[PDB]
Amino acid sequence: QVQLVQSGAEVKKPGASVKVSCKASGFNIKDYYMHWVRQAPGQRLEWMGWIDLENANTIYDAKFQGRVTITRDTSASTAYMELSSLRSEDTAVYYCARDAYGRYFYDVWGQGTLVTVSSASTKGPSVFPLAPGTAALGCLVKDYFPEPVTVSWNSGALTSGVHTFPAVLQSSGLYSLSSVVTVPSSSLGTQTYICNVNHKPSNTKVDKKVEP
Amino acid sequence: QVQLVQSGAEVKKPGASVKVSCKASGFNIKDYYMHWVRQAPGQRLEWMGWIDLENANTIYDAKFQGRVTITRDTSASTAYMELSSLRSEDTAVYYCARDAYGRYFYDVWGQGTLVTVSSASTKGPSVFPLAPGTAALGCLVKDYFPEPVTVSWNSGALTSGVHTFPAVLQSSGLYSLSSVVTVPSSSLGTQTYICNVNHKPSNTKVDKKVEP
Amino acid sequence: DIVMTQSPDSLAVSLGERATINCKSSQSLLNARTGKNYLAWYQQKPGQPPKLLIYWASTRESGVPDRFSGSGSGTDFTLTISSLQAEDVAVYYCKQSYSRRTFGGGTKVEIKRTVAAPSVFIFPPSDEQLKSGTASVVCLLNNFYPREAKVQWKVDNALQSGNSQESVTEQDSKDSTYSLSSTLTLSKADYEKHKVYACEVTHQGLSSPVTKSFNR
Amino acid sequence: DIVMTQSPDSLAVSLGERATINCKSSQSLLNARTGKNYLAWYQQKPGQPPKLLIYWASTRESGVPDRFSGSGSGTDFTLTISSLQAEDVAVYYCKQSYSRRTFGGGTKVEIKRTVAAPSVFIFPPSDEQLKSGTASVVCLLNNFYPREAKVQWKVDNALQSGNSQESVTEQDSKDSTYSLSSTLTLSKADYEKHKVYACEVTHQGLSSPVTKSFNRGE
Amino acid sequence: QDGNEEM
Amino acid sequence: QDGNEEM
């Protein structure tokens, strides 16, 4: 079973470098090329370059000439992308993908690695209630860094009518998002509503009971 | 004679604030808005906000809300942009530009103000020779802060074939650049070649004869 | 580089109906020695890498349903979904591999439905947040269609700008609507300088803007 | 916020030829009661603020040559330069002023010329630098076209990674070429351990890569 | 000033 | 690998 498994998310300050790994399992890498493609949040896919996994020859996109380095370790069945002189505009999900002579398509991709480039420091969220025939209620998940956060309602027992919105990046360099649910107003006195917030980057878990 | 003249370059530590001025002359500012627009190195122009130069009403972009203050002094015919809690990402050229009701275009701009935000301290470069039908020679201008430096050859008498490259920012947080020139190789024994390097931030003036 | 231009940027079709996406390249992608056009179509859903659907312009990847097909040669290519199914809602990208790699800008495919006006709700800051010195006021626009909607915050009837940020969900898989959350942020001191906090909402499903408000 | 997208990101045109720059807005820029599309084009050269060329989508600013023209309506706009002159090498930006202000990403316009291979030079570290414990080795690629060039550093045949940085001049006004400088930075201790220092250059104008090298101590 | 508010 | 170099 062919797989490409990438290293975990990274947070970097401007001027730093990052090096992302892509471990190939279930095929002989030498018959292939590994490519790197990145995608800033909400934006287009951007090719960065390739490496011939047999002989280690590389080709880089003009936009990264002189800043990117692609390498591979045969015995570890792993390819690497290192990007230096990072700027905030390099915040993106970085993907590896395989290709081969004769193919010229990407049939298998890594899961992606988020690299956030920012002067901000890792910070878990504050969670505030959005108190309430239909009523709306929710939670405001404020001031965290980096992405992502997850929100569930009543541990996943409440899914109908839930909307968890994309995060916005505040002038402080910290993110904020909201999550809301609509419920029968007759239920406010009998049903309890709890938002469960997780921020894995800071190993922060918060639950907030939202009351009328 | 309409013009917008901004204050000089600034160097700031992270966490500090900066206030840039924009002196307007040659028109009645009361009929205009003054906008502030920035441009990080190599990036697109980004609008920050505007002020109504009559009543001082401001509108800021959400990305800078809470960190930026735009003010105007009618008696000094000057507008100001103050940006606080500076961070590395704020390194940019800041521009003022006028606009008005019924126009919605920027016909007149200030000259720009470079603000560098870095933990580095102002420091002057070391200058090293790049010793030589056609020969190449040059000077390496290494380890200075902040930008810019100027390079001339033979006090400006030698301009043909000169290339002075853009500085690169090193992981130390200091800049380095090179300046080269191609000359007839026969002239290496009779024609003296001196690179004149100035780093005004550190009052550095260095003359380096580059010899075979 | 070779420039890839997709059109349209967004498409809404009803379940079971035909969807067509176009891709133009700035030069021919055909290698005459192989007869191949090096053009591929990828499908991407949130949180995932793109998934290959079609390569060599018209060859379908293993496991891809036959309602997806690719056509074209040279500089003009088309991805057709013969009958849209719910699981086909996603962003589609064309990509050339004739010389280096370049991707088109993406086409977002959504389910068309009838216009639906938002239900609007406003939330004052919590006492917990105020204790900390800051006041966030939230306006929710729930279950509307189409996506285009406008929120205007007013504080003591003064129109606000720059002190709010908003975001929108992707289309809801059950009822094909959108929702939007806007947050107005003030310091506590500033929040206590005003009385009336209002969010005014403009939307095609509303014959006139709707305002929700509260007094601090 | 209105999102402005420009296409292409860079353009190379021969002198006297036509340059076309496209701009797309995420929402219409047309005010129905004035008939104006609040779209503008600016030209920016290094070290300078942008210069207004075209406003209200198609109205040319005072003093701008008539070879610059803008067209389009709603969400799709185009800037055409009808006969490119050397003075027109710049980055062009579209910008909407319908609701707040947003610039596109910029389109860099350069002069297209015949391919030109680089002349390559390598420079050892000076003795004066070596005393401070650092060794800078410089590879120069001079007066080439097109801009794309690949520089690899080899120390005793071993490809170097992560210890070099490069930069490229703007296009030369006279001959429309670029130059590139790459600096390999080593500690003195590492510099002393090796003999052969080489930069290998790959470029369209070279039938095969070109290596320039020196042996430390000659 | 915003173009969409030109009267 | 580039499609235009396939044999």
Coordinates of N, CA and C in Angstrom, one line a residue, chain D residues 22-95:
Chain D
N22 N -3.9 41.4 -17.2 CA -5.3 41.2 -16.8 C -5.4 41.4 -15.3
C23 N -6.6 41.9 -14.9 CA -6.9 42.1 -13.5 C -8.4 41.6 -13.3
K24 N -8.6 40.8 -12.2 CA -10.0 40.3 -11.9 C -10.3 40.7 -10.5
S25 N -11.5 41.2 -10.3 CA -12.0 41.5 -9.0 C -13.0 40.5 -8.5
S26 N -13.1 40.2 -7.2 CA -14.0 39.2 -6.7 C -15.4 39.7 -6.7
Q27 N -15.6 41.0 -6.9 CA -17.0 41.6 -7.0 C -17.0 42.8 -7.9
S28 N -18.1 43.2 -8.4 CA -18.2 44.2 -9.4 C -17.7 45.5 -8.8
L29 N -16.9 46.3 -9.6 CA -16.4 47.6 -9.2 C -17.2 48.7 -9.8
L30 N -18.4 48.4 -10.4 CA -19.2 49.4 -11.1 C -20.2 50.0 -10.1
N31 N -20.2 51.3 -10.0 CA -21.3 52.0 -9.3 C -22.3 52.4 -10.4
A32 N -23.5 51.8 -10.2 CA -24.5 51.9 -11.3 C -25.1 53.3 -11.5
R33 N -25.0 54.2 -10.4 CA -25.6 55.5 -10.5 C -24.6 56.5 -11.0
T34 N -23.3 56.2 -11.0 CA -22.3 57.1 -11.6 C -21.8 56.5 -13.0
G35 N -22.0 55.2 -13.2 CA -21.4 54.6 -14.4 C -19.9 54.3 -14.3
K36 N -19.2 54.6 -13.2 CA -17.8 54.5 -13.1 C -17.4 53.1 -12.5
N37 N -16.3 52.5 -13.1 CA -15.7 51.4 -12.5 C -14.4 51.9 -11.8
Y38 N -14.4 51.6 -10.5 CA -13.3 52.2 -9.7 C -12.1 51.3 -9.7
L39 N -11.5 51.2 -10.9 CA -10.3 50.4 -11.1 C -9.2 51.3 -11.7
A40 N -8.0 51.1 -11.2 CA -6.8 52.0 -11.5 C -5.6 51.1 -11.7
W41 N -4.7 51.6 -12.6 CA -3.5 51.0 -12.8 C -2.3 51.9 -12.5
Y42 N -1.3 51.3 -11.8 CA -0.1 52.0 -11.3 C 1.1 51.3 -11.9
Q43 N 2.2 52.1 -12.1 CA 3.5 51.6 -12.6 C 4.5 51.9 -11.5
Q44 N 5.3 50.9 -11.1 CA 6.3 51.1 -10.0 C 7.6 50.6 -10.4
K45 N 8.6 51.5 -10.3 CA 10.0 51.1 -10.5 C 10.8 51.1 -9.2
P46 N 11.9 50.4 -9.2 CA 12.6 50.3 -7.9 C 13.0 51.6 -7.3
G47 N 12.8 51.7 -5.9 CA 13.2 52.8 -5.2 C 12.1 54.0 -5.2
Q48 N 11.0 53.8 -5.9 CA 10.1 54.9 -6.2 C 8.7 54.4 -5.7
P49 N 7.8 55.4 -5.4 CA 6.5 55.2 -5.2 C 5.8 54.8 -6.5
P50 N 4.7 54.1 -6.5 CA 3.9 53.9 -7.7 C 3.5 55.2 -8.4
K51 N 3.3 55.1 -9.7 CA 2.9 56.2 -10.5 C 1.5 55.8 -11.1
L52 N 0.5 56.7 -11.0 CA -0.8 56.5 -11.6 C -0.7 56.6 -13.1
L53 N -1.3 55.5 -13.8 CA -1.4 55.5 -15.2 C -2.8 55.7 -15.7
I54 N -3.8 55.0 -15.2 CA -5.1 54.9 -15.7 C -6.0 54.8 -14.4
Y55 N -7.1 55.6 -14.4 CA -8.1 55.5 -13.4 C -9.5 55.4 -14.0
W56 N -10.5 55.0 -13.2 CA -11.9 54.8 -13.6 C -11.9 53.8 -14.8
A57 N -11.0 52.8 -14.7 CA -10.8 51.7 -15.7 C -10.2 52.1 -17.0
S58 N -10.6 53.3 -17.6 CA -10.1 53.6 -18.9 C -9.7 55.0 -19.1
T59 N -9.6 55.8 -18.1 CA -9.3 57.3 -18.2 C -7.8 57.4 -17.9
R60 N -7.1 57.9 -18.9 CA -5.6 58.1 -18.8 C -5.3 59.3 -18.0
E61 N -4.3 59.2 -17.1 CA -3.9 60.3 -16.2 C -3.1 61.3 -17.1
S62 N -3.1 62.6 -16.7 CA -2.4 63.6 -17.3 C -0.9 63.2 -17.4
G63 N -0.4 63.4 -18.6 CA 1.0 63.2 -18.9 C 1.4 61.8 -19.2
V64 N 0.5 60.8 -19.1 CA 0.8 59.4 -19.4 C 0.7 59.2 -20.9
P65 N 1.7 58.5 -21.5 CA 1.7 58.4 -23.0 C 0.5 57.6 -23.5
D66 N 0.1 57.9 -24.7 CA -1.2 57.3 -25.2 C -1.0 55.8 -25.5
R67 N 0.2 55.3 -25.4 CA 0.4 53.9 -25.7 C -0.2 53.0 -24.5
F68 N -0.5 53.6 -23.4 CA -1.1 52.9 -22.3 C -2.6 53.1 -22.3
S69 N -3.3 52.0 -22.3 CA -4.8 52.1 -22.3 C -5.4 51.0 -21.4
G70 N -6.5 51.3 -20.8 CA -7.2 50.4 -19.9 C -8.6 50.1 -20.5
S71 N -9.1 48.9 -20.2 CA -10.4 48.5 -20.7 C -11.0 47.6 -19.7
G72 N -12.3 47.2 -19.9 CA -13.0 46.3 -19.1 C -14.0 47.0 -18.2
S73 N -14.8 46.1 -17.5 CA -16.0 46.6 -16.7 C -16.3 45.5 -15.8
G74 N -16.9 45.9 -14.6 CA -17.4 44.9 -13.7 C -16.3 44.3 -12.9
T75 N -16.0 43.0 -13.3 CA -15.0 42.3 -12.6 C -13.7 41.9 -13.4
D76 N -13.6 42.3 -14.7 CA -12.5 41.9 -15.5 C -12.0 43.1 -16.2
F77 N -10.7 43.4 -16.1 CA -10.1 44.6 -16.6 C -8.8 44.2 -17.3
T78 N -8.3 45.1 -18.2 CA -7.1 44.8 -18.9 C -6.3 46.1 -19.0
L79 N -5.0 46.0 -18.8 CA -4.1 47.1 -19.2 C -3.3 46.7 -20.4
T80 N -3.3 47.5 -21.5 CA -2.6 47.2 -22.7 C -1.5 48.3 -22.9
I81 N -0.3 47.9 -23.1 CA 0.8 48.7 -23.6 C 1.1 48.3 -25.0
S82 N 0.8 49.2 -25.9 CA 0.6 48.9 -27.4 C 1.9 48.8 -28.1
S83 N 3.0 49.5 -27.6 CA 4.3 49.3 -28.2 C 5.3 49.6 -27.1
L84 N 5.8 48.5 -26.6 CA 6.7 48.5 -25.4 C 7.9 49.3 -25.6
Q85 N 8.3 50.2 -24.8 CA 9.5 51.0 -24.8 C 10.3 50.6 -23.6
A86 N 11.6 50.9 -23.6 CA 12.5 50.5 -22.6 C 12.1 51.1 -21.2
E87 N 11.6 52.3 -21.3 CA 11.1 53.0 -20.1 C 9.9 52.4 -19.4
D88 N 9.3 51.4 -20.0 CA 8.1 50.8 -19.5 C 8.4 49.5 -18.7
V89 N 9.6 49.1 -18.5 CA 10.0 48.1 -17.6 C 9.8 48.5 -16.2
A90 N 9.0 47.8 -15.5 CA 8.4 48.2 -14.2 C 7.5 47.1 -13.8
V91 N 7.0 47.2 -12.5 CA 5.9 46.3 -12.0 C 4.6 47.1 -12.1
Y92 N 3.6 46.5 -12.7 CA 2.3 47.2 -12.8 C 1.3 46.6 -11.8
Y93 N 0.5 47.4 -11.2 CA -0.5 47.0 -10.2 C -1.9 47.5 -10.6
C94 N -2.9 46.6 -10.6 CA -4.3 47.1 -10.5 C -4.7 47.4 -9.1
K95 N -5.7 48.2 -8.9 CA -6.1 48.6 -7.6 C -7.6 49.0 -7.6

